[PDB]
Amino acid sequence: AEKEKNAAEIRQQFAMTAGSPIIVNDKLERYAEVRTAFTHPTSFFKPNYKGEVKPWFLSAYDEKVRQIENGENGPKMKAKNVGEARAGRALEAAGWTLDINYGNIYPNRFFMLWSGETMTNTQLWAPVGLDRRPPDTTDPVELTNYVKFAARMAGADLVGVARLNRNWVYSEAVTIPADVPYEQSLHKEIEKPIVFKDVPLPIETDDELIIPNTCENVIVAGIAMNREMMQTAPNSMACATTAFCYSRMCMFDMWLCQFIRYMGYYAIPSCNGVGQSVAFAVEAGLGQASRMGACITPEFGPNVRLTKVFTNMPLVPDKPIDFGVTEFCETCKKCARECPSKAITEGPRTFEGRSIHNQSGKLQWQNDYNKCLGYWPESGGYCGVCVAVCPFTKGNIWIHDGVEWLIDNTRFNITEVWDGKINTYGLDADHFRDTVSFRKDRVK
Amino acid sequence: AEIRQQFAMTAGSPIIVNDKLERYAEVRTAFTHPTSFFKPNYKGEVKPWFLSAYDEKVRQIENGENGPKMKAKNVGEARAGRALEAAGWTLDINYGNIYPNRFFMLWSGETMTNTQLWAPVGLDRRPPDTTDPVELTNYVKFAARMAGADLVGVARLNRNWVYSEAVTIPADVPYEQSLHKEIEKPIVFKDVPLPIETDDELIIPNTCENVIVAGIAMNREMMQTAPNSMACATTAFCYSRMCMFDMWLCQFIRYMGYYAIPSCNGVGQSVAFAVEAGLGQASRMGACITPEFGPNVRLTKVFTNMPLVPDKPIDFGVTEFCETCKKCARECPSKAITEGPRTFEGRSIHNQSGKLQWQNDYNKCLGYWPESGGYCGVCVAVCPFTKNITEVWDGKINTYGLDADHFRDTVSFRKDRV
Ligand code: SF4
Ligand code: SF4
Ligand code: SF4
Ligand code: SF4
């Protein structure tokens, strides 16, 4: 008979010995965040469908408006009617409610404050003194259990811990000056170094973002997207599950930072800022890096968002996992064949970046992310076709052969989504048991 | 979904009222009224109730307790429970988000960062492309589930349950002075295009036909520790879930071409709205009891002119079960819950007279909160419909505290949305 799926058993089967899995050489240096395709001047501007060059997201807005007017849910994808096209973009737009400028990247601004002191919740609770009282627990084992429990309350579907590898922290952040209001933020972005110094608490000066040398650990969360909606990529409902999960990421960061602070430690939130989430996720054991560039997890494949919190709280690092992703990506190449911009390489991994958007000096599949971003104005969304077609995004990829777990090699419209299955936060009760957690799962 | 169809009743508010019913001023609640707001701490110092409760939390942590006369495993465990409680409230203002059109509860989306970022698309300025209440009901309920509701229902807006006057603050008062500068402000209905606040009035349009009610499920293991700290923590986390639900859903409704008023614990009486929208039935303890969660579920609501199909009220025997049960009343640590029958006359200023209900003494309830250092919840914990702290911390958990053993019960297809 079919063995009842056991996600915890799967993770124990593929656990590695300690050690960062990312292979590097001497040319590796920390990466300036301005180099990402979203921010770099070489890629930030894209033509709209009339050929006008604009910031990428404004050209993409022009295409969303055109599609609604034409009763479309995506590029050359007719909707049931104009009302349905409108509803998908209303859902997408609303999903972003708790996110600043598509990613919350500015450190120590808006939702991403590096201290809790000014938050309305901290002020309300100040008479209890939780953020001022020294820690009552310093045992990393108990702290790992407490913080992971808090993380699940805070909306993480996956959580892991790693020692902080500074190679993946941006050398300089993209941010705005402290006196600039929101309405001018996109006009006034600047660079600001992220440095490590012998200081007691995370602190920002006029010149630097200063992370203390005691900032030992990073906690990485996986926030699961909805499979039915992502499978509509590159159309509007894939944009909506993306958007809602960015607001879930924000809530997670603030909730968890506040818990850590109220435990007597400091905590730095980040969402899409501060450093490279995929690298942290691999080092924390959530999954393995893939050909498309994303972290593939056993539970969700790549159909999961990442965020992370940095802290001096003593914790037990998790072990990395190797469930064969590298070898499957070597022979699969489905994302590369289906990518509408041919951004994903069909070749082998190298240490040499394809362009300024890649960090050289680490062995990885080198993709052209300017080509990726170029398809977003064309399609009026955030694509996601690579995630949608990845075999690991399918549910029930795992089978048991009587001895051990293995991957099933055989695996290698929008009206119906609106009328079909949904549940709280887009989670799927057919698979939600996979992320149940007991103390045995949280700390060893 | 089969159970809910089996117990659907014919249309009509199931709350029985008489000719004495008047709308209720929010300042009368035990949290805000001057006769109940102040309570002594354990040293005998009279303070605002929540500050006296803070003193008890501090005392408990120092003494290694998770609750009144409940020893923790150690001081570290005691500290962790209160840290989790305090963190849970991150997205909530002054225990409930009650001030309308302040902080997270804005009545227009125009000034929000998300609306400003999306302004070039014009979704909030474009007339609706859908006016069909059937299609709108399916769209908005799908959105409500994305926004974190475990249950969602629609009712026509009964103004009897809208507060006659809200508790709020002046618009330009900063957060740090909010608690000391609370004021009362009328909520009125007028022929105006959009919800609007003047110096004198909170104005809801006469076109505000409907209320969308969400149920936000709490964690059963944690609530079972009532009145101790982990019950407080699931309470707190769900208040922040409520706030995010209201903002997400209001934005979706605005981007569909309609207006939307968030509320959380403000604007009107959630239990009455939830009963009229079919989420559950009112109970002896005073809560809406649902089939899926019993009373172990939080409520929020959004008011809108979006055309919608109202849901049917449900009757699965709660009234007859409460008539003979009395378990919450016997376990209540403050004897706040009556063992008598339902009447139309409130016991004190804190109750709204003129509706048939079990009349409870809610100042007695609030008095227990500084003594126990929490938000109690024993009545919810012991209710048959709802079915140590080290074991909770070491035990089962899942995303947002939801339980995969029961999560299938809230799956939704179009069939059950409209
Ligand atoms: S589609 Fe295939 S090659 Fe691409 S990430 Fe998924 S498994 Fe790897
Ligand atoms: S998001 Fe789309 S364009 Fe970008 S890499 Fe994936 S498939 Fe290609
Ligand atoms: S404990 Fe008994 S009387 Fe009280 S609300 Fe629950 S069922 Fe009704
Ligand atoms: S919360 Fe506690 S004190 Fe209040 S009515 Fe319920 S059992 Fe009684």
From Swiss-Prot, chain B:
GO terms for cellular component: cytoplasm; plasma membrane. Both the processed and unprocessed enzymes are catalytically active. PCE-dependent growth and PceA activity are inhibited in the presence of high concentrations of 5,6-dimethylbenzimidazole (DMB), probably due to the formation a DMB-containing nor-B12 cofactor. Dechlorination of PCE is stimulated by ammonium ions. Activity is inhibited by chlorinated methanes. It catalyses: trichloroethene + chloride + A + H(+) = tetrachloroethene + AH2; trichloroethene + AH2 = (Z)-1,2-dichloroethene + chloride + A + H(+). It is a peripheral membrane protein. Optimum temperature is 42 degrees Celsius. Belongs to the PceA family. PANTHER family: IRON-SULFUR CLUSTER-BINDING PROTEIN, IRON-SULFUR CLUSTER-BINDING PROTEIN-RELATED. Monomer. This is Tetrachloroethene reductive dehalogenase. It comes from Sulfurospirillum multivorans. The gene is pceA.
